[PDB]
């Protein structure tokens, strides 16, 4: 009854940084050639969502955010062939054109098509799908889930099992898959290593789970808000330490603690400092050391490089090294038969209306991933 | 007969920074426990010794210096096993203790005992086999080549082949051995591959040495000495490139040169700057950069930590990777095979009395090895 209408419909548009967002009308526009316009059911909240708010990752406003989500299509344009009405859907905030360079290689999966490197806020034809006020609203990294109905290009949407629950496998589109790959993939964490994980939110929780799928050992979660600690226990931490209980910096407590260095570490919080503290931490001559945090804006660390001519390892990915459309679909039958577990990161249930509550719990630490419900 | 005697012969001494070095009259103790004393036969003259010199790298002085050598063992401590009397040696600077974590790893080469981290200037039992004018005279990387006979730990020699040419062998001391390691072993570069190598020197030809060796299609030669371009082309470089020559940086122009970036890159220089634009000039999702150069004491880069989250990977490493006794005779048995070639390094061969000119050819640009005969 909508297809090839312009849908009114509420989302959250942030009109200015370190600002409520507002639930408001929208007009969000019918999709254009090679677009899917979905009927959102469930969206996360992720830290990299708040990052817009505060200015940490920087990309045109007005907005509509939100990455991590799962929804209904409501109608493909022209030429669309990996989607179909009615089909559940996990938008892809790093896209998989499957025609680039990087698409092409067997470890890459940072789509040349993504909108996170230089962010632009539109489309892949370079205009916007929405209006809010007679106004043009921006996309956000080709995705826009804090809306009823968003549209995104082929690129960025994936088909998913048909009796998938919408408000758990929403999770697969950023915080789970994210953390969960940083250490299957793209760290490859190996049977009895030591892991330390700096960041014990929705990723770093998706991380440890991914050290312990691998069999690592000992596996050492890092925060400085000990309410993190127990649910890190409950997903396989070994033991917990926060830097704020030790005269000495953290590095240097975590190697005493591996007895000379871990074998894998990563960044799961966003802070230069922390960066520079998971490398040194990880063993000198064989250490690995994964950045999953997005850093500040235009920001640049200070580094000593003999740390890395020792031998250590350093890597970064986005969305845990996984080649999205082709990931994301596996993702969810691998949740479906048990694989691993959703329900761990899930401490808060909210109608979509309670964004900005939401939004609070993650600010005061209380929440891992709130589930906002359309 | 010398064994179990104290040795008066000639040495190079530096007794401080940013002076020749001192051609005279040393005392070699002989060797204790585990110890070994080798007759030099010839040594190279790689960068790091002149780190040593310029203070970019810190040791203790006064000191004998020199680590890329072969030579035939004078004489044994007590319960040597490794080596005998006559054997042909090479010198390791990275020991291989076989006890130790690293040392166990099957990645790992930068063995706990190496005196590269924090120099000491001494064996193992942290004494100096070495008297000059009555005063001490430290060690270097536990080897002190620069000497007509030094003392060495038995974890820091490996026997090799007693049909072996001393005169080019030594080379597999350290830059023949880094450069092709950093390549096969750190970089693991692949068929069809594109690289890039900063810096062509003597490390830096061996690099593409083993670029070659490993398949890649392209290998780009970065270097603002066009003179070291024939030589480098003559081992395999597909182009070089001269960073002055151009109005850009160069990791744009090189990543405009392999429309969007190099698979492998390598610094090959020890400067800070070039650490970071080797880094950026390998794709931003898959590339890996290899740090090689010795950076100067004390001093930290700056970065984008941008550039390792879209998916790059930046490791160094000590020897190419290389578990050096293991790995130095079989080098030795490839090189007698004709797996890989050496006088391409050699540029200049001198009696050692002449090592300030050898120097002096390595600063002015005109050397790649110089080879100091005994
Ligand atoms: N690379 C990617 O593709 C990707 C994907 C998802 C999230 N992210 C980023 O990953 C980071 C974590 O996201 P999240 O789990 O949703 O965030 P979160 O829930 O805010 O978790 C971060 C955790 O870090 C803790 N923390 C803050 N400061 C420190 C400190 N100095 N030392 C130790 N712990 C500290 C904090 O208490 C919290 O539990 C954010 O920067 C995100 O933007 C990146
Ligand atoms: N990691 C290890 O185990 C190891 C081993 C051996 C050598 N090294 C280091 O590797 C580096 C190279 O050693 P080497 O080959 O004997 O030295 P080298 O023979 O002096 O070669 C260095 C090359 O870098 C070139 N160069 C200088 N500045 C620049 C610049 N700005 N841009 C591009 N090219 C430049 C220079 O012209 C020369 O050809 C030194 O820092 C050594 O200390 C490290
Ligand atoms: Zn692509
Ligand atoms: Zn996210
Ligand atoms: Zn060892
Ligand atoms: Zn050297």
Not at 88 to 97: E, G
Not at 287 to 307: A, E, F, H, T
Request: with cysteine; hydrophobic share 40%.
């Amino acid at each position: 009854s909508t297809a090839g209408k312009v849908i009114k419909c509420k989302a959250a548009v942030l009109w200015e940084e370190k600002k409520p967002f507002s639930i408001e009308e929208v007009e969000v526009a019918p999709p254009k050639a090679h677009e899917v316009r979905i009927k959102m059911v469930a969206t996360g909240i992720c830290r990299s969502d708040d990052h817009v708010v505060s200015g940490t990752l920087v990309t045109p406003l007005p907005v509509i955010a939100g990455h991590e989500a799962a929804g209904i299509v409501e109608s493909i344009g022209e030429g669309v062939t990996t989607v179909r009405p009615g089909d559940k859907v996990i938008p892809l905030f790093t896209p998989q054109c499957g025609k680039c360079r990087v698409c092409k290689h067997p470890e890459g999966n940072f789509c040349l098509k993504n909108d996170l490197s230089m962010p632009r806020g539109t489309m892949q034809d370079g205009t916007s799908r929405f209006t809010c006020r007679g106004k043009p609203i921006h996309h956000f990294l080709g995705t826009s889930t804090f809306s009823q109905y968003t549209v995104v290009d082929e690129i960025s949407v994936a088909k998913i099992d048909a009796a998938s629950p919408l408000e758990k496998v929403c999770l697969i589109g950023c915080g789970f898959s994210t953390g969960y790959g940083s250490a299957v993939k793209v760290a490859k964490v190996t049977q009895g290593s030591t892991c330390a994980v700096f960041g014990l939110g929705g990723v770093g929780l998706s991380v440890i789970m991914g050290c312990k799928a691998a069999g690592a050992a000992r596996i050492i979660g890092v925060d400085i808000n000990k309410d993190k600690f127990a649910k890190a226990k409950e997903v396989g931490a070994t033991e917990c330490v926060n830097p704020q209980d030790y005269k000495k910096p953290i590095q240097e407590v975590l190697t005493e603690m591996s007895n000379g260095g871990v074998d894998f570490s990563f960044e799961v919080i966003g802070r230069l400092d922390t960066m520079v503290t998971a490398l040194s931490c990880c063993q000198e001559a064989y250490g690995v050391s994964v950045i999953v945090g997005v850093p500040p804006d235009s920001q640049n660390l200070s580094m000593n490089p003999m740390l890395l001519l020792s031998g250590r390892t350093w890597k970064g990915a986005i969305f845990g090294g996984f080649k999205s459309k082709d990931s994301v679909p596996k993702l969810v039958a691998d949740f479906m038969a048990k694989k691993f577990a959703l329900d761990p990161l899930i401490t808060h249930v909210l109608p979509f209306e309670k964004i900005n509550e939401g939004f609070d719990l993650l600010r005061s630490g209380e929440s891992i991933r709130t589930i906002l419900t359309f």
